Design a protein around this nucleic acid. Structure first.
Ligand SMILES: NC(=O)c1ccc[n+]([C@@H]2O[C@H](COP(=O)([O-])OP(=O)(O)OC[C@H]3O[C@@H](n4cnc5c(N)ncnc54)[C@H](O)[C@@H]3O)[C@@H](O)[C@H]2O)c1
Ligand code: FES
Ligand SMILES: [Mg+2]
Ligand SMILES: [Mg+2]
Ligand SMILES: [Mg+2]
Ligand SMILES: [Mg+2]
Ligand SMILES: [Mg+2]
Ligand SMILES: [Mg+2]
Ligand SMILES: [Mg+2]
Ligand SMILES: [Mg+2]
Ligand SMILES: [Mg+2]
Ligand SMILES: [Mg+2]
Lengths: 161, 70, 96, 46, 86, 108
RNA sequence: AAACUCCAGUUGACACAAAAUAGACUACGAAAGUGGCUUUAACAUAUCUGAACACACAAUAGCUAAGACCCAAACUGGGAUUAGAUACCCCACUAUGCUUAGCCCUAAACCUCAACAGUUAAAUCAACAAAACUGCUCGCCAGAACACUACGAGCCACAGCUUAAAACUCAAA
């Protein structure tokens, strides 16, 4: 879910006395009257507070994963509307690849933080396929038949025994 | 650069394109027959599979699709 | 020995030259300024070899002129006659 | 300082109450954005 | 078509000197590039040919300017021989 | 963000111009805008003849409306200006002051 | 010469087309490409390398459907020329160039320079191109032609694209 539009900008959230200003100033300094990048910054800060142990450290692998996850969500939201944007499709796919690489590094280095990142961001880590080969019509049909024939043989052997 | 190789490529391609135009009707029949034989070979491979497995016929509900007919 | 030269940046270094519009804001609504960089007879935008502007301000003036022309602030096919008696800042002479 | 400047600035914004008066005042006013430059790099105001 | 008339590309005549005004108009139209535009627009110029032409003209202008600068720099030495004989 | 609406209105008498300006600002506010200031650049001859709403215009009144609005408002407001019959031409730009004036050291 | 004379000139109204001048700028993007105005989204990665086939893309031309049609224009007609001229020149007019949704997957797709890191010391260095090299990785190459071919395989492609031989021949290329 997006932060409420009434939320203050990241840059005006700690200035002393921000609660004693007029409603007009509050609107002027909120997410309602800003571009989407400020909303993404607030999302990033929220995720950093929720997940990482030290939210001030932005150079850590977890922080980079959070930032790229927010960027990926932005790209997906863009592409729902812009179906023919090939450049942004490329950017989304490349960002997904980079996040998978960082997740692999995190899993190999810090499993607890890896689990926290996976739960907090709703990411499902998957292992890459072992072989990259075309699944053409002949192979697909043959594999389906082979699975069917194995099932039939299993049924026949169960009947026999 | 050698322009003669580019010229020879031009001549060979132009000569090739003339042949396919001349024998176009013959080629289509040959390709259709080849695709028929291809489909038959694929079906025989599938039949060999279920025959070796032990089943006397194909698995119930299985029908070998035509994966080479346009 | 004290007389040896000492490492130092050139103190006589002359300031880099600046274009006439350096540091000044170019607005599409300032048609008076924009009209100083177009041909009086055709309204065509002068090149930098004529205006003498740097690349950044040349681009700024070009964009402002196009914006003003399309938004209904500036004429396209001529310079507005109200600005024909402004200071001449372009190095072009028609021997007119 | 940003917030303080904006606070003192909002006091002169057009609300639904002063819309008529502000529109009339603007109709009784003129703003000029025109100014030219000289060969010496000096601004000459209209 | 939608602009005011008799302002663009318009020249006034001085003391009935029609020829001088016409030649000034020709000078203006040539200096603003309009004559070249009209002549070039009679037939379509392919984008590749246009790019090649502009590249050639830019490089020719640069080369000519550099050669002229070189000759103007070496023209200073061109004077009467001060050590004639030796 | 902060936007500037450049408005070229029909050359009208004072009451109609006032009504049109009030209507435009009311549309801005209805679309969630906070209007900062309204500036009158004056009535002047148009640079060229403009055809709008089956009418030809050679003179017009130039106005500027500075405001803060959500990004979704702009498109909506544009449509509104397309329907207003007293508006010869309306354009919403990003406010020029919001653009940063980067400083230059001169020609290299 | 044909063609038009519902022709031509001034004025006014008037695009689903392509975008003078700026640009003598050399910018953006992975490349292809990108040069009228505004706004909204928006240009991955805080080691590097890493694929004909995996995942995404890819000028022009071309194929399906619907739409728009000013101009241009393969084809197709007419006029003229020519020994012949169904080419070149003139006139008219299509597919196509445009939009939408799908395909096709090719270019002198070239800076004819593979990606990252480093050096300017050496004998600089076959030549020319574009100063000479080093470390590391991937891809590729082992005489010419047969051959951007045959067969096999894959492919929304069916006169198509990718991958890609051998036999005969030669002393060269
Ligand atoms: N073939 C595989 O699926 C596979 C799996 C793991 C690693 N690799 C590595 O990739 C390199 C290329 O292997 P190859 O010569 O046998 O492939 P190849 O070029 O000869 O093609 C055979 C198959 O491997 C795939 N392939 C090709 N290059 C690949 C790559 N870099 N990574 C993954 N798949 C690739 C192709 O899709 C194809 O289906 C090798 O170094 C190999 O160790 C390949
Ligand atoms: S020289 Fe500084 S802006 Fe032009
Ligand atoms: Mg890589
Ligand atoms: Mg390989
Ligand atoms: Mg390829
Ligand atoms: Mg294509
Ligand atoms: Mg047509
Ligand atoms: Mg090239
Ligand atoms: Mg590589
Ligand atoms: Mg080919
Ligand atoms: Mg074959
Ligand atoms: Mg082939």
């Amino acid at each position: 879910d997006d932060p409420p539009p009434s939320t203050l900008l990241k840059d005006y959230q700690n200035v002393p006395g921000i609660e004693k200003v007029d409603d007009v100033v509050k609107r002027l300094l909120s997410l309602e009257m800003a571009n989407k990048k400020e909303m993404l910054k607030i999302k990033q800060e929220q995720f950093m507070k929720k997940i990482v142990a030290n939210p001030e450290d932005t150079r850590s692998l977890e922080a980079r994963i959070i930032a790229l996850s927010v960027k990926i969500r932005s790209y997906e939201e863009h592409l729902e509307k812009h179906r023919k944007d090939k450049a942004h499709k490329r950017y989304l796919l490349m960002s997904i690849d980079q996040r998978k690489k960082m997740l692999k590094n995190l899993r190999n280095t810090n499993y607890d933080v890896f689990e926290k990142i996976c739960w907090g961001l709703g990411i499902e880590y998957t292992f890459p396929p072992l072989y990259y080969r075309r699944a053409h019509r002949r192979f697909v049909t043959k594999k389906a038949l082979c699975i069917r024939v194995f099932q039939e043989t299993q049924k026949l052997k169960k009947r026999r025994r | 650069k050698n322009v003669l190789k580019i010229r020879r490529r031009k001549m060979n391609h132009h000569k090739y394109r003339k042949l396919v135009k001349k024998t176009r009707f013959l080629r289509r029949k040959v390709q259709e027959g080849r695709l028929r034989r291809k489909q038959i070979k694929f079906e025989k491979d599938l039949r060999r599979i279920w025959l070796k497995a032990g089943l006397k016929e194909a698995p119930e509900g299985w029908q070998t699709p035509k994966i080479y007919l346009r | 020995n004290e007389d040896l030269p000492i490492s130092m940046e050139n103190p006589y270094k002359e300031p880099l030259k600046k274009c006439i519009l350096c540091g000044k804001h170019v607005d599409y609504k300032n048609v008076q300024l924009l009209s100083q960089f177009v041909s009086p007879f055709t309204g065509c935008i002068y090149g930098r070899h004529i205006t003498g502007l740097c690349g950044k301000k040349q681009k700024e003036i070009t964009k402002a002129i196009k914006r003003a022309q399309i938004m209904g602030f500036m004429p396209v096919t001529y310079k507005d006659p109200a600005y024909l008696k402004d200071p001449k800042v372009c190095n072009i002479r028609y021997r007119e | 300082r940003e917030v303080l400047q904006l606070q003192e600035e909002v006091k002169n914004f057009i609300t639904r109450e002063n819309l008529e008066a502000r529109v009339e005042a603007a109709l009784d006013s003129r703003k000029n954005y025109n100014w030219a430059i000289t060969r010496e790099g000096l601004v000459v105001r209209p | 078509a939608k602009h005011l008339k008799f302002i663009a590309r318009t020249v006034m005549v001085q003391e009935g000197n029609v020829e001088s005004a016409y030649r000034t108009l020709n000078r203006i139209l040539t200096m603003d590039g309009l004559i070249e535009d009209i002549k070039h627009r009679r037939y379509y110029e392919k984008p590749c040919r246009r790019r090649q032409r502009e590249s050639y003209e830019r490089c020719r202008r640069i080369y000519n300017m550099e050669m002229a600068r070189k000759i103007n720099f070496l023209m200073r030495k061109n004077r009467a021989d001060p050590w004639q004989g030796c | 963000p902060r936007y500037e609406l450049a408005l070229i209105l029909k050359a009208m008498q004072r009451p109609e111009t006032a009504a049109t300006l009030k209507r435009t600002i009311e549309a801005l506010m209805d679309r969630g805008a906070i209007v900062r200031d309204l500036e009158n650049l004056g009535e002047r001859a148009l640079p060229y003849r403009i055809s709008a709403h089956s009418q030809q215009h050679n003179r017009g009144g130039y106005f500027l409306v500075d405001f803060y609005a959500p990004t979704a408002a702009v498109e909506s407001m544009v449509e509104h200006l397309s329907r207003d019959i007293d508006v010869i031409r309306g354009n919403i730009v990003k406010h020029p002051l919001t653009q940063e004036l980067k400083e230059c050291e001169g020609i290299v």
